Amino acid sequence: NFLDFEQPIAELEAKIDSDEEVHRLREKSVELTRKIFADLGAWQIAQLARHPQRPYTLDYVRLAFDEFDELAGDRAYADDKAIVGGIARLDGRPVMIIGHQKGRETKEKIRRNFGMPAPEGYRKALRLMQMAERFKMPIITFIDTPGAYPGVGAEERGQSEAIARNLREMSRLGVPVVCTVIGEGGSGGALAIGVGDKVNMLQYSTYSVISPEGCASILWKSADKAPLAAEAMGIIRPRLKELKLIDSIIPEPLGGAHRNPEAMAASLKAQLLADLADLDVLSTEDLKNRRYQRLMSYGYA
Amino acid sequence: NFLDFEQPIAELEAKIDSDEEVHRLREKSVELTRKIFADLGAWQIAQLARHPQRPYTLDYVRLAFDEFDELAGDRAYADDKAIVGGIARLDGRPVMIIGHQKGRETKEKIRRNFGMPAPEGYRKALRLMQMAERFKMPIITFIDTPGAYPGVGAEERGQSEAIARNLREMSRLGVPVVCTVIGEGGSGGALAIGVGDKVNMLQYSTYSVISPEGCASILWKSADKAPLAAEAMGIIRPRLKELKLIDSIIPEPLGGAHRNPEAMAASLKAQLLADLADLDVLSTEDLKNRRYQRLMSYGYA
Amino acid sequence: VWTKCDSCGQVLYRAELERNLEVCPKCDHHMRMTARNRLHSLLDEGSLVELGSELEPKDVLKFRDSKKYKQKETGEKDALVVMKGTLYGMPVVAAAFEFAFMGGSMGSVVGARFVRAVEQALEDNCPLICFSASGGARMQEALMSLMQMAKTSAALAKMQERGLPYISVLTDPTMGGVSASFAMLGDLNIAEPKALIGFAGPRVIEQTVREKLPPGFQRSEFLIEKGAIDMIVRRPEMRLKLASILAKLMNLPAPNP
Amino acid sequence: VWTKCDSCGQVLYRAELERNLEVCPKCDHHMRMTARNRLHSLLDEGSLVELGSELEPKDVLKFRDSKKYKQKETGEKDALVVMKGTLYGMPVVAAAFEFAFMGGSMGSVVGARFVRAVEQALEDNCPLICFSASGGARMQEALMSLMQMAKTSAALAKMQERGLPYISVLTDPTMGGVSASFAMLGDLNIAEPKALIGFAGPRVIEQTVREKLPPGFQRSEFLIEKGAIDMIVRRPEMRLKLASILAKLMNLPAPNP
Numbered sequence A, B: 001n002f003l004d005f006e007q008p009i010a011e012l013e014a015k016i017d018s019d020e021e022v023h024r025l026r027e028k029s030v031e032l033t034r035k036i037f038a039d040l041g042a043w044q045i046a047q048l049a050r051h052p053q054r055p056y057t058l059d060y061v062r063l064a065f066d067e068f069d070e071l072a073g074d075r076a077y078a079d080d081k082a083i084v085g086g087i088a089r090l091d092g093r094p095v096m097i098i099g100h101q102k103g104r105e106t107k108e109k110i111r112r113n114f115g116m117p118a119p120e121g122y123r124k125a126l127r128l129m130q131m132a133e134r135f136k137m138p139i140i141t142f143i144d145t146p147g148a149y150p151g152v153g154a155e156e157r158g159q160s161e162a163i164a165r166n167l168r169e170m171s172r173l174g175v176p177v178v179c180t181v182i183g184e185g186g187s188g189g190a191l192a193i194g195v196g197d198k199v200n201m202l203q204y205s206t207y208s209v210i211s212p213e214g215c216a217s218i219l220w221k222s223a224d225k226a227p228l229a230a231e232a233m234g235i236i237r238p239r240l241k242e243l244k245l246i247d248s249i250i251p252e253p254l255g256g257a258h259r260n261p262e263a264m265a266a267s268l269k270a271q272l273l274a275d276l277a278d279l280d281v282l283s284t285e286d287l288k289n290r291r292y293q294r295l296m297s298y299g300y301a
Numbered sequence C, D: 001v002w003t004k005c006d007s008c009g010q011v012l013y014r015a016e017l018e019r020n021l022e023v024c025p026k027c028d029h030h031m032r033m034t035a036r037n038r039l040h041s042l043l044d045e046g047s048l049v050e051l052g053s054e055l056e057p058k059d060v061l062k063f064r065d066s067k068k069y070k071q072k073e074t075g076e077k078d079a080l081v082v083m084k085g086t087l088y089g090m091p092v093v094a095a096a097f098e099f100a101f102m103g104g105s106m107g108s109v110v111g112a113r114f115v116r117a118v119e120q121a122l123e124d125n126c127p128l129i130c131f132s133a134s135g136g137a138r139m140q141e142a143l144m145s146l147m148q149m150a151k152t153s154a155a156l157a158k159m160q161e162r163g164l165p166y167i168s169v170l171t172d173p174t175m176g177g178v179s180a181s182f183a184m185l186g187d188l189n190i191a192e193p194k195a196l197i198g199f200a201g202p203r204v205i206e207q208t209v210r211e212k213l214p215p216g217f218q219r220s221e222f223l224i225e226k227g228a229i230d231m232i233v234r235r236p237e238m239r240l241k242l243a244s245i246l247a248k249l250m251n252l253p254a255p256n257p
């Protein structure tokens, strides 16, 4: 449950047990939980992103979309459980939703490799983006994964090609694609479904070309000194926006998305609607050109 | 070596051991081997098709094509050894060659499932037909397989979808496709690479929706009574041609293709050249339309 | 009129297996469901307009028995039955196999009729749905049967470049030829509960590796885990679900449950 | 000038590892082969025209060391080196990684330069070849590095719908980011003998399943059997072979050996 430094907020949760009007001392609860979050360090942020009570793909699927039919398999090997995808409506408008599904409990986490997919997962992810296009449908993805599952079968089964083939095929997609990092944007295993027209990122989510711990123990010969790496690379929401890297930063409730998923859904569901509409004034031809263009610009050369 | 009823021809092979001019008694060898083959029964034919000394894919690859580079793998699982494919020239003209590779010896046969491919083999077969198209290249396939490998991994890996996906994708192929049954045209595992514009069949090769033995032990509750099935279904070269089913019947040397692969290559290599040229007077648009048309006509409704 | 259940035995009143669509209410086990009936239980009311009815077979090879094994126990032309119509006011073609007819064996008529559905759904410019149940291709028509695969699959291709949704519904059982053709080329592959689907029958498959076949091997539930199936929908729910999905693929308004 | 061999020890005269292209003549073991040299050993004579040379990096994040770790031991801008030119009189672009440069790490310049090769090969309307050697993306440029994957791969897409052949040559080693991007999106994926290719390094991979990694795991020979590689061509033969293949894909006349 409750994160680390949220302790005093957790302790202040001792209100339910409770003149009789003092019940509104929680005004101070609202503060504190306000000042505590005002000065959070890079490393501290990634912890919220990885927060144990943070909403996952399916949560928003149930909180913001209706008539969601989850499609399974890649047609050739299996149905990766680290990837959730299917056809649903977004205020009537059918959409193709694809995302990393971690899992609250340690058991679900196991059943879904903590959201790290195997090559057969990206192959499924793409099959769906492809079905979207086929039926002039929009594609909405939710990124939240520690990264692509590193393993033997993964390699033996083309974890590289799988990812690559997606980066290629996604760019040529002929419909709008809004990508939101709702949690942990890990490596290219996250990028394998992050090549979109609009690329929003929630206030406390992160994104990096490698996990902090790794980068840490590689350029600092120290594991624990990961926080140092986190602030070095620039894995935080704004740190990125200041570089044309992400389009918009969707904000979370007071003290984190976990503190109120129904409001977070609101904010997000809204943002999607925004992008997914100021994008229909574009012709397929233009859309793709816009994307390709935005794609070549990434970087400084 | 030598087949069954070819015995007297085998016995007559006792000439090498040998007036001195009698060495041309082999005029009678040429006959006999002429009269023996003149009256061969349906079942007897399928035996030549399955003949142990019959030329396989690679044989023609080396006998009629040059600069042959064999491509491997499907990009996702493995490199099926029951399927041979690659880029070569046919009198300068580059071509994409794909075919069932059985294998002379019992060891090679094992290394290549006696030419029965696994779903990962058709996936490779298609990847290559696709690379052909991409580079405005012709596709030439050689059919010779007992059928699609029936197994657990085969099923678990989509032997059905694999085959189907090919029948679909092959029809839409945007280049000329000449298909020749050089051996045993078995089920849809052979059909998985037999959807062509021109579909020739060697004189002694066969083709069926199911093997005789099976069909036998299913509609005759008898295995051995397969020959009966063979004549019933119509698995022989002409038996088919008499039904707009195959385009042309390429002839084999005197007494079988095994009796002289260099001549068979000649005949075949020729036939290909024929079709693969009276097909270039067609526009892609027309080509495909021609094919689709020839495709809907199959049957009697 | 009191039938017994395949795998359960729970006696049941025929009129009951009606609003329960030939399905066991105590075991949920799906059972043999007529080709013409299915089409009804799907398409709305009255809208049913049969296609390719002006299509009948014929033995062109003089096979053993053949002409005689080939209509009194099904009152139908061939294993497949195409039918135009609507789903919740949505124009949509359908088609279903009659596993009672020799095994829903695919051959000439089956392929022709199918193609029809595609031709029809093509100019009308509407979705296509196909319920599949077969044991392979009609050996009695040999290579004619085989070719059907390449054809039906070739047509389905037009269907797709056109952007029209085709849903294949694989029902117990769907094997060999059909399984390995249009019955697996659907935009959405949907299998009814505990169905038996595969290319080679367990029979032959077994006497090959000469061992024990894994548990579930070739059942909706097995397949769905090998990613060969998009989802497994129960029969009663099938009607609306199909409309639900199809409705989204077609951008039309959701059906009114 | 008498160097020793990596895995063999067989002393060798430098001038020897010349017409033998940095390859062990007694062990056939392929060794470190300069990025600018490779391009030479491929492209014909004189035809070499460098592209994207007017491209140099810069630290935009103020990383640890960074500006200092970033040219005296390679006399090059960034790990990749694009070069226009010809092969047996055939116009063809090329590009190769300098694994000496931090690890051939992909980042900003690497991606830009690559894109160039594609842009160049696009209007010229000629084949593209890329020799790859890297250990991942340049962490020093963070998400900028990552994005390169999506970009280079996005461009390669234009290349393909245009019908132009792109051959990726994976050389020991090609891992992570590049491995999982354009380095695996080639029309033909060719690996040099006994190369080490993969997405995750054996290092991390190992300390995961916490066991012994299979024999060969991630080597040209292993990969080729998992179908990730089209074929494995030796270095000396590489030149002509590339021309041979490319020549066929381009319909041009076979090169004159």
Ligand SMILES: [Zn+2]
Pocket (backbone or CB within 6 Å): C005, C006, C007, C008, C009, C010, C024, C025, C026, C027, C028, C029
């Ligand atoms: Zn029951």
Ligand SMILES: [Zn+2]
Pocket (backbone or CB within 6 Å): D005, D006, D007, D008, D009, D010, D024, D025, D026, D027, D028, D029
């Ligand atoms: Zn050596």
